[PDB]
């Protein structure tokens, strides 16, 4: 039937558990390395590790050791890109080291680290240059494989550091960094490896960022500037000057993310409305500035704190094929596109299986749907062209219950069902053999494999003892590796499976049949290019070889309506109801308007509403090219005219050096008339004020309110600016008028007396007591009560102009008391100022006389003569019943016995009860 | 009958008019000078002058001239005090000069002036030292009779410059000046001849430096709420003057600091009418009440006057006018202000029926210093150069009036009053009150002359001249010990002056002997001889004796002391008399008690408290016993903390985080050495200090988190306990604001203005709203306001916001229409799903709607305005302007809305519709 070999190997170290990282190194070397690492729970995440090395297809592993003292290698060991050099890092309790090897891990030389470690990053082409992120947010660099080190930046952000492009930027030693400047600022720096001392420079002028520097592998550079009202986003093509990215003007953005800047254009996702659910997919032009709509809604989750994810996948086998998941209402649908985002379509159902009754769904009512990147407790692989295998549902939407493994071998044109429940999938020999293992918690020893692209499957016992399946790997050939811990023991075991005994013959050039790449409409001209791949013949058993030849038949097509899409500000009308696709101009934008900050001398390029698909290679010249070659920019009218006083302004005292400053925005080319009126008769006309750079002096004589009016007049437009100023300076003193003592739940009339009588514009801050934030009042008087007893501080603050006066006063709040009203004589009013000291002394003398006439305690009588113009008094009698005797005694000592007052020479005042 | 000589002289220069100044010079010289000056009307006041000199009792005047070019000497020529030196000043059009003479005006030497002139001032004793006030407010000085000059100060105040005392201050070259410092400050300088400056304490002043001839010095410090006044005795440290604590003062004025005490007048309540007369102690600090109400007017702009007069004949006799309700009464005192009494009526005259007033119902009243003259003349001044002679005009009844002016006199210092003249008369004393001359003050010409030799009991008339003369002025020989009178005036408007020198010496050839005088004991209205604890007796010339009182007059020879009695003591600071006067004792008033310590009593010093009684200052009664009440109280306790104040440097309104905040603390009433200063800045920073107010250095702090904080300070002593609080706010960031307003709306339509700020709900914000033509804005605490527009056209609406100490401001232009028609508009429900409140979205939607309406009706586009409102349900208003045929347009628009659907392509495959709205 079949023919294969299985070789098992157990890691002899029984002290093995948790995780492991297995990696090959180089081609035509046959050397494999394994790192067995032990994680820790309860937020510990501390590690213990062991190293294994093989040099014979992974059949004999030796456990490597380093010195009598065993160094604990951390999880991350870094290989050199493109060049076989290995670096291992170690971490303990605040003590670290490194190990270097240039002999495929044969001789590890130890070196120390004079700093912490978090991650590393090599150079794309230079094998010996590498930089390091120090855990306390530092950036070091080394050009000698990390033997010696030097310092660069000290406040770098997490994982926003990138090397220069190999092909672009002309400089291989550039380092783009994002770092914290000032207190609460972030800026984008650019240094060199050897000289970062004073050589860096700043490409963006302003340089504020909320941690969002991003430069993808290709030629584009991005920047995210946070602002006051609405944030902005800038872009740089070929490291040129930055330009503000053009999004839909009124589709306001919240967050955005760069999905893929592949080939010559950019794909971005922008969440418009804060649904925390749906994103919109937009596509740019060559420079990455003019963005247009592509897809409406896509799923979005926040798995990690800083990392968000968007349900979209590029098929790496065929360039220009994308899959996505939309969410409308509460329904999750799946769509796929071959036109690189122009037109999306649903998935074609298979309607067949090994146990598939054909009563299942038809096109019109329910389709196929797939789980892309989200696994509600999934892998979709694509290493070979046209082979797309994944788990999904089949119906009107996706659900969490059903997980069925479907596959397609012709890039989505023909779908077929294979497995029930999820299965780990592995391709071998450029999609020559497809292996699958059931993902489950129970142990097993089975193995599914297919040779005819998923049409006929075969089972085989690859081992004897059942093993828990942990992972599958393949050679950078037909060597498969299955690693996992067995049922009985808890130690690791690897099984190397060799399919090379079967079909030993090498494929010739005539052993493949041609398969033309089509779409769901049967059209061959995809992206203006007819493509055809090679598929192994069913009646042929051979190995596809060291290098696979495919996509040999590639022809060009003539340009058609399907090869053009809408530009910035244009959308498809009626969903192409009339005939075919038509890009009509939406309401918000018209092609007449100039772009933001068009400066004279430069030339912006407007569009007619149609643009060729980027990287489409159809026969150009004719066929609705619509290349405008529009170079123009018009003269600007005076806009954003601003007038102010030097500093924070809006406060003046008479006879003071007031300095007025004026500023403009759009342009200084035209001669401008500046008419100026300062509201006090001073009329004056000036010219070239914004270009002169000199302020205007003025001194106001009379206190009052004034209005400054300025008019800027040109041949293009006409603008006006106004500024109201107040000159109200003198504030001498204030006073808080308040009763010195009052009972609980009694209405208190607080008053704020100022030096000028009823000032026109005053604000009052009132501080009651324990409550911190004060009350705002426009009137002099307020009314308040006291629920608590004891002593309370009442504070008042006033500020007419830019000067503040403030006064506090302590008041007593009683509880056990009796109230007695008191009339005074009429003559006293002729010698009664509102001075509180006079009132206090009058109350003291009245209390003294009452104590002399009743022989009762003096501290138990409180006299308050009030602030009213008619002299009215209140007598509070405390208890701490016998209180009736004291009350009667006081009433008799008031009525029957006159309480006399010697005010001035020959003037007597009397006090009695008050109705 | 009588015997006298009259010698007339006419200034031969017929070109003479306007004014003249006549002055003598020296004794035993017989030299007189006259300066005839000609003023000019119509705000000109430019002068032309001539000089006359005589050397024989004014019988032969020579018109002096100086050089071929006649220099016009201005009004002021200055003589040397005490020393015969004369200085003349000249003025032209910005060119001046001076003339000096040391030979009684025999040889005038000319010198120039390198500056302007306004007034001069000599030294009390140094004849060659003199200072000058330059018109543009400068002060120059010269020690060589004004030949050479040097500069002192450049911003001096008008007539507040004084020389040092001759007896006091130990320094003769001191100059006390008041000058303007900084911008809007005034200070008191003390300068010397060689260079100018301050040794004594000083501050801000509102032009009120005053140093009377005697040993006292005063100062008036203006403050914020209530001003203060300081005093300095014998040029010592200044002390705050003690007035009644609750009798609040408005203005005060120093009347007389004569002998050993001070008299001040203080207006308590702003009646612009009555002042209160107060008396001080030796140092001039503890003031007590003396008199209640006195008249007060503002005749000149800077000069005020108070109706009170000191009798220069007898020290300690004062006259005053009180005003109660609307009645003006007159009072006099002999006790130097202790007890006042009304005037005794005469009840007799040459034509005096005795039915006139009696004591109980109506008295005598006199016009002291006030001349209410609706008609011609009527000006009254009461003079007293001789002891006991007081002559003046007044009324007789219950009060003073403007009508009646009758000249009364008293020769025994107010004990016996007598009526003399009807209507006013100029009066002149000769030979220490030996001959009394009088001339009727009137507009008509006259040639009569009244004179009396028996102290105003028998009067005689005499034709002193032949032709009737207009009476201009009267003068006498220096010393007032001769009998030469001089009457000057122009005769019958003959355009020239005439002087008449009258000599009474023929009738009085004898020199008085020591036995030609009779004794007159000085008494009061009660007949008591012990006045001021001193029996006094003066000399009066006998009626049967014709002699000249002589070069020097001997009087008050009998002066004996009396034993101290109740009448020789008065109340001290804070004590008043019980019941009323002339009835029933210095009792302590309510506001002050003798327990309290004085202001700023420092440990180690000893203040002297009082019992409520003090001896009349300068009373020389037999002391030792008789209620002396000399306490000899030397003690001082520690003072409690009073007037604790805490603030930020300057007028800090608001603060931003991470800023240099400087806190300052100060005390006022009293100072204490050991002091606890507890301090809490409301952000966890607790700290205790000592000697904060004495160090004088602020405290630095930087707030980190924005918010509101409270600074609390506590001063703790063994005497008391004080606390000071200061609330501060740190609310700095204001990024941007926006005025949300409909771009256009009709007349009398309710407009909802809104002010959007960067924070959605800022806690404490004030909003200033500027509607349009009205200047003063409206104040608001809420974001939104509602207003209308009565006028049409274009209107600017402005809004201003200020949370902390930062201001944001935004304006917007709105259109107000008149000829319009309103159409409501429903939008589709789907549109609400893509409708943000961004105004640009709304404006573009309105623009597209207007475009489609213009395409569907072919009517003008500018006459259709679409406003889609800010409401969450999308509602639109369409305004159709006229500048009838408007019905056709309205019907066309309604049909183009209903019958023809107005489509809107929002997004790919989404159509919106608009129609009419119920
Ligand atoms: C690598 O190995 C393959 C097959 O083993 C061989 O064809 C190839 O030539 C080798 N590479 C080189 C550079 O020789
Ligand atoms: C960089 O610095 C080194 C010294 O550290 C110096 O020799 C070299 O010339 C510098 N290179 C540049 C480009 O500044
Ligand atoms: C400045 O003023 C000159 C003449 O007043 C005018 O020609 C010019 O256009 C103005 N603006 C400039 C130089 O930018
Ligand atoms: C003052 O208190 C009285 C009595 O409680 C109250 O009627 C009045 O409204 C208060 N406020 C005033 C008078 O402004
Ligand atoms: C002035 O002269 C007279 C007459 O000789 C003489 O009595 C008198 O004493 C002189 N004056 C003085 C101040 O001596
Ligand atoms: C005048 O001189 C004194 C001491 O000679 C000096 O203190 C003072 O400052 C001088 N005046 C001025 C204005 O400098
Ligand atoms: C002046 O004298 C004449 C007689 O010589 C006399 O009739 C007259 O009354 C006197 N008085 C006046 C004012 O004429
Ligand atoms: C505190 O202030 C007093 C002044 O009352 C001073 O005498 C003393 O030396 C000061 N102590 C200090 C500064 O330590
Ligand atoms: C008010 O001020 C406090 C500062 O303590 C701040 O935390 C709060 O956000 C502000 N606004 C409201 C509505 O409390
Ligand atoms: C103004 O605002 C109020 C709510 O504060 C609303 O009820 C009213 O309809 C608004 N009126 C206009 C004319 O906008
Ligand atoms: C931001 O700008 C919009 C205009 O698009 C304005 O309506 C709004 O008031 C501004 N401020 C805030 C806080 O949104």
**Sheet containing strand B363-366, strands side by side:** B363-366, B390-397, B406-410, B417-422
What is d(CA A282, CA A269) in angstroms, rounded to the nearest whole number?
6
What is d(CA B313, CA B410) in angstroms, rounded to the nearest whole number?
12
Question: Residue A258: in which H helix or E strand, if any?
Answer: strand A255-260
Look at chain A and count its residues: 915
**Broken C–N links (> 2.5 Å) in chain A, after residues:** 82, 377, 476, 880
Ligand 5 center–CA A634 separation, angstroms: 109
Report the b/e string of B266-291 with b at 16+ CB within 10 A: bbbeeeeebbbbbbbbebbbbbbbbb
Largest CA distance in chain B: 140
Min distance A834 CA to chain B CA atoms (Å): 10
DSSP reduced 3-state for A689 = helix
By the 8 A CB rule, do B708 and B725 touch?
no
Query: B373: closest CA among B424, B421, B440, B418?
Result: B424
The answer to whether A859 contacts chain B (CB < 8 Å) is no
**Sheet containing strand A322-328, strands side by side:** A312-314, A322-328, A331-337
CB contact under 8 A, A650 and B758: no
What is d(CA B602, CA B672) in angstroms, rounded to the nearest whole number?
8
Residues 6 or more apart whose Cβ sits within 8 Å of residue B745: B751, B789, B814, B815, B816, B817, B867
DSSP state of A887: H
Min distance B835 CA to chain A CA atoms (Å): 9
What is d(CA A176, CA A121) in angstroms, rounded to the nearest whole number?
13
Out of B289, B779, B909, whose CB is closest to A761?
B779
Two tokens at B101?
Answer: 């003479």
Residues 6 or more apart whose Cβ sits within 8 Å of residue A884: none
What is d(CA A800, CA A789) in angstroms, rounded to the nearest whole number?
34
Q: Using only C-alpha atoms, what is the Rg of chain A?
A: 43
Ligand 7 center–CA B375 separation, angstroms: 29
Two tokens at B498?
Answer: 């005439």
Bridge partners for B822 per DSSP: B879
What is d(CA B356, CA B346) in angstroms, rounded to the nearest whole number?
9
Of B602, B694, B695, B717, the one to substitute when testing ligand 8's pocket (max ligand atoms within 8 A of C-beta) is B694
Residues 715-734 of B with CB under 8 A from A: 724-727
Out of A808, A902, A906, whose CB is closest to B580?
A906
Residue A823 burial class via C-beta count within 10 angstroms: exposed 0-12, middle 13-18, buried 19 and up: middle
| Multiple choice CATH, A734-814, 3.30.460.10, 3.40.50.620, 3.40.190.10, 2.60.40.10 | 2.60.40.10
Two tokens at B100?
Answer: 């000096």
Q: Tell me which CATH homologous superfamily contains domain A642-726.
A: Immunoglobulins (2.60.40.10)
Min distance A436 CA to chain B CA atoms (Å): 44
Residues 6 or more apart whose Cβ sits within 8 Å of residue B168: B215, B234, B235
Ligand 6 contact, B197 CB (< 6 A): yes
DSSP characters over B351-403: T--TTS--TTT-EEEE--S----SSS------B--STT-EEEEEEEESS--SS
Residues 837-856 of B with CB under 8 A from A: 838, 840-841, 844-845, 848
Two tokens at B569?
Answer: 């003591």
Query: B189: closest CA among B180, B204, B203, B176?
Result: B176
DSSP reduced 3-state for B801 = strand
Q: What angle do CA A638, A641, A643 make, to 5 degrees?
A: 150
Ligand 11 center–CA A229 separation, angstroms: 6
User: Would you give the end-to-end CA distance of chain B in angstroms?
Assistant: 122
Question: Residue B486: in which H helix or E strand, if any?
Answer: strand B484-490
Strand segments (E) across A656-780: 658-663, 673-677, 683-687, 696-698, 704-713, 718-727, 734-737, 741-743, 748-754, 764-767, 775-777
* Fold type of domain B558-637: Wheat Germ Agglutinin (Isolectin 2); domain 1 (3.30.60)
Q: Which of chain B's residues have a Cβ under 8 Å away from the Cβ of A587?
A: 844-845, 848, 904-906
Which residue has tokens 């016996």? Answer: B416
Report the b/e string of B429-466 with b at 16+ CB within 10 A: bbbbbbbbbbbbbeeeeeeebbbbbebbeeeeeeebbe
Q: What angle do CA B531, B532, B536 make, to 5 degrees?
A: 50
B199-206 LR contacts (CB < 8 Å, sep 24+): B200/B232, B200/B235, B200/B237, B200/B238, B201/B237, B201/B238, B205/B178
What is d(CA B498, CA B695) in angstroms, rounded to the nearest whole number?
75
By the 8 A CB rule, do A833 and B248 touch?
yes
CB contact under 8 A, A804 and B651: yes
Q: Which ligand 9 atom minimizes the distance to the CA of B706? A: 4
DSSP reduced 3-state for B479 = helix
What is d(CA A689, CA A692) in angstroms, rounded to the nearest whole number?
5
DSSP reduced 3-state for B276 = strand
What is d(CA A901, CA A846) in angstroms, rounded to the nearest whole number?
8
Q: What angle do CA B631, B637, B641 make, to 5 degrees?
A: 135
Q: Which ligand 8 atom minimizes the distance to the CA of B671? A: 5
What is d(CA B555, CA B537) in angstroms, rounded to the nearest whole number?
8
Q: What angle do CA B263, B267, B271 make, to 5 degrees?
A: 150
What is d(CA A781, CA A747) in angstroms, rounded to the nearest whole number?
12
Helix, strand, coil percentages, rounded to 5, for chain A: 5, 40, 55
By the 8 A CB rule, do B665 and B645 touch?
yes
Q: Using only C-alpha atoms, what is the Rg of chain B?
A: 42
Domain boundaries, chain B: 223-306, 311-423, 558-637, 645-726, 737-817, 820-916
Assign 3-class secondary structure to B722-762.
EEEEEEEEECCCCCCEEEECCCEEECCCCEEEEEEECCCCC
Two tokens at B264?
Answer: 């001040």
Ligand 7 contact, B462 CB (< 6 A): no
Give resolution, Å, one decimal: 4.2
Residues 355-374 of A with CB under 8 A from B: none
DSSP characters over A775-844: EEESSSEEEE--SS-EEEEEEEEE-SSS--EEEEEEEEEESSEEEEEEEE-SGGGGG----HHHHHHHHH
The answer to whether A647 contacts chain B (CB < 8 Å) is no
Two tokens at A483?
Answer: 């690693």
Ligand 8 contact, B694 CB (< 6 A): yes
Two tokens at A155?
Answer: 């406040």
Two tokens at A591?
Answer: 């092609």
Any alpha helices (H) in B680-736, and if so which ranges? 692-695
Min distance A95 CA to chain B CA atoms (Å): 36
Residues 6 or more apart whose Cβ sits within 8 Å of residue B144: B128
CB contact under 8 A, A765 and B768: no
Residue B623 burial class via C-beta count within 10 angstroms: exposed 0-12, middle 13-18, buried 19 and up: middle
Whether the domain at A642-726 and the domain at A734-814 fall into the same CATH topology:
yes
Residues 6 or more apart whose Cβ sits within 8 Å of residue B139: B131, B132, B133, B151, B152, B153, B154, B156, B161, B177
Query: A726: closest CA among A656, A816, A814, A829?
Result: A656
Residue A142 burial class via C-beta count within 10 angstroms: exposed 0-12, middle 13-18, buried 19 and up: middle
Neighbours of B883 (CB within 10 A): 7
Of B741, B743, B744, B752, the one to substitute when testing ligand 10's pocket (max ligand atoms within 8 A of C-beta) is B752
Of A227, A228, A229, A252, the one to substitute when testing ligand 11's pocket (max ligand atoms within 8 A of C-beta) is A229
What architecture (CATH level 2) is domain B645-726? Sandwich (2.60)
HSE-CB at B865 with a 13 A cutoff on CA atoms is: 19
Residue closest by Cα to atom 4 of ligand 8: B673
Neighbours of B792 (CB within 10 A): 13
Any alpha helices (H) in A653-765, and if so which ranges? 689-692
Q: How far is CA B182 from CA A697, B133, B135, B155, B186, in A?
A: 22, 21, 21, 11, 8
Q: Is the dihedral of CA A451, A453, A457, A462 positive or negative?
A: positive
Query: A609: closest CA among A588, A632, A591, A630?
Result: A591
Q: What angle do CA A377, A380, A385 make, to 5 degrees?
A: 175
Residues 6 or more apart whose Cβ sits within 8 Å of residue B579: A905, A906, B585
Min distance B220 CA to chain A CA atoms (Å): 18
Torsion angle, CA of A133/A138/A139/A140, rounded to 10 degrees?
Answer: -90
Residue A406 burial class via C-beta count within 10 angstroms: exposed 0-12, middle 13-18, buried 19 and up: buried
What is d(CA A121, CA A463) in angstroms, rounded to the nearest whole number?
40
Query: B193: closest CA among B111, B129, B132, B113?
Result: B129
Query: B334: closest CA among B530, B121, B497?
Result: B530
By the 8 A CB rule, do B233 and B283 touch?
yes
Two tokens at A98?
Answer: 């490194």
Ligand 9 center–CA A252 separation, angstroms: 28
* Fold type of domain B737-817: Immunoglobulin-like (2.60.40)
What is d(CA B574, CA B611) in angstroms, rounded to the nearest whole number?
10
HSE-CB at A687 with a 13 A cutoff on CA atoms is: 5
What is d(CA B156, CA B141) in angstroms, rounded to the nearest whole number?
13
């Amino acid at each position: 039937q079949v023919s294969l070999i299985s070789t098992s190997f157990v890691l002899k170290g029984d002290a093995t558990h948790n995780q492991a990282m297995v990696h090959w190194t180089g081609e035509n070397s046959s050397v494999i390395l394994i790192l067995t690492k032990y994680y820790h729970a309860d937020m510990g995440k501390v590690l213990e590790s062991s190293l294994w090395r093989s040099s014979d297809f992974g059949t004999t592993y030796t456990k490597l050791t380093l010195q009598p003292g065993v160094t604990t290698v951390i999880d991350n060991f870094y290989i050199c890109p493109a060049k076989i050099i290995l670096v291992s890092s170690s971490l303990g309790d605040r003590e670290q080291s490194l190990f270097l090897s240039t002999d495929e891990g044969a001789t590890f030389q130890k070196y120390p680290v004079p700093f912490l470690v978090e991650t590393l990053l090599f150079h794309p082409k230079e094998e010996d240059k590498v930089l390091a992120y120090t855990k306390d947010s530092k950036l070091y660099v080394s050009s000698d494989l990390g033997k010696k080190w030097t310092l660069l930046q000290e406040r770098v952000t997490k994982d926003h550091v990138f090397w220069a492009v190999s092909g672009v930027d002309d400089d291989p030693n550039l380092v783009h960094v994002e770092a914290q400047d000032l207190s609460g600022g972030y800026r984008y720096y650019t240094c060199l490896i050897y000289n970062c001392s004073a050589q860096p420079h700043i490409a963006p002028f302003s340089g504020p960022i909320d941690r969002g520097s991003l430069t993808v592998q290709d030629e584009y550079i991005f920047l995210k500037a946070t602002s006051t009202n609405r944030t902005k986003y800038y872009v740089s093509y070929r490291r040129s000057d930055f330009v503000l990215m053009k999004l839909p003007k009124y589709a306001l953005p919240k967050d955005l993310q760069i999905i893929s800047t592949d080939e010559q254009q950019v794909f971005v996702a922008v969440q418009e409305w804060n649904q925390v659910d749906t994103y919109n997919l937009y596509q740019s032009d060559l420079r990455g500035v003019r963005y247009s709509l592509v897809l409406e809604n896509v799923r979005s989750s926040r798995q990690a704190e800083e990392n968000v994810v968007i349900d979209i996948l590029e098929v790496r086998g065929v360039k220009g094929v994308f899959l996505a998941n939309q969410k409308v209402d509460g329904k999750v649908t799946t769509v796929i596109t071959y036109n690189k985002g122009r037109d999306w379509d649903y998935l074609r159902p298979p309607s067949t299986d090994m146990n598939g009754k054909p009563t299942n769904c038809q096109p019109p009512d329910c389709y196929l749907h797939l789980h892309l990147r989200w696994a509600d407790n999934v892998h979709t692989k694509d290493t070979a062209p046209g082979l797309i295998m994944g788990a999904g549902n089949l119906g009107s939407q996706l659900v969490e219950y059903k997980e069925e493994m479907y596959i397609t071998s012709d890039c989505g044109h023909t779908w077929r069902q294979v497995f029930e429940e999820e299965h780990h999938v592995l391709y071998l020999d450029h999609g020559g053999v497809i292996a699958a293992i059931k993902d489950t918690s129970i142990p097993l020893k089975i193995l599914k494999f297919s040779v005819d692209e998923g049409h006929t499957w075969s089972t085989h016992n690859f081992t004897s003892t059942s093993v828990f399946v942990d992972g599958l790997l393949s050679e950078p050939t037909l060597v498969m590796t299955v690693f996992g811990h067995i049922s009985f023991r808890s130690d690791w075991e690897l099984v190397k499976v060799d399919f090379r005994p079967s079909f030993p013959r090498q494929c010739g050039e005539d052993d493949y049949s041609s398969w033309d790449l089509t779409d769901l409409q049967g059209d061959h001209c995809i992206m203006g290019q007819q493509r055809s791949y090679r598929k192994r013949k069913s009646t042929s058993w051979c190995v596809k070889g060291r290098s696979f030849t495919s996509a040999l038949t590639s022809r060009v097509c003539k340009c058609r309506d399907s090869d053009f899409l809408c530009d910035y500000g244009f959308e498809r009308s009626s969903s192409s109801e009339s005939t075919a696709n038509k890009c009509s101009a939406n309401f918000w934008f018209n092609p007449l308007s100039p772009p933001e900050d068009c400066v004279l001398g430069q030339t912006y390029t407007s569009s007619l509403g149609y643009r060729k698909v980027v990287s489409n290679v159809c026969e150009g010249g004719v066929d609705l090219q619509q290349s405008p070659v529009q170079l123009q920019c018009p003269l600007q009218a005076p806009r954003g005219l601003q007038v102010s006083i030097r500093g924070e302004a809006v406060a003046v005292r008479p006879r003071e050096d007031v300095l007025f400053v004026v500023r403009q925005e759009q342009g200084d080319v035209l001669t401008t008339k500046y008419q100026v009126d300062l509201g006090d008769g001073f009329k004056a006309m000036y010219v070239n004020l914004t270009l002169t750079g000199e302020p205007i002096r003025h001194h106001y004589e009379s206190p009052g309110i004034y209005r400054v009016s300025v008019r800027a007049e040109n041949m293009a437009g006409h603008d006006e600016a106004v500024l109201f100023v107040q000159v109200n300076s003198p504030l001498q003193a204030l006073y808080l008028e308040v009763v010195p003592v009052i009972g609980v739940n009694q209405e208190v009339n607080l008053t704020a007396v100022l030096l000028p009588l009823n000032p026109n514009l005053t604000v009052f801050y009132w501080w009651i007591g324990h409550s911190l934030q004060p009350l705002l009042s426009l009137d002099n008087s307020v009314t308040t009560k006291f629920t608590d007893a004891g002593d309370v501080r009442v504070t008042v603050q006033a500020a007419c102009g830019n000067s503040v006066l403030q006064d506090s006063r302590l008041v007593r709040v009683l509880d056990q008391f009796q109230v007695v009203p008191l009339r005074f004589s009429r003559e006293l009013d002729t010698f009664n100022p509102n001075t509180p000291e006079w009132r206090e002394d009058v109350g003291l003398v009245v209390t003294r006389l009452l104590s002399k006439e009743t022989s009762i305690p003096e501290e138990l009588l409180v006299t308050v003569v009030k602030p009213g113009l008619p002299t009215i008094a209140d007598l509070y009698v405390l208890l701490p019943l016998t209180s009736d005797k004291r009350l009667a005694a006081v009433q008799q000592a008031l009525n029957s016995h006159r309480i006399s007052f010697i005010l001035r020479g020959g003037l007597r005042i009397l006090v009695e009860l008050r109705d």
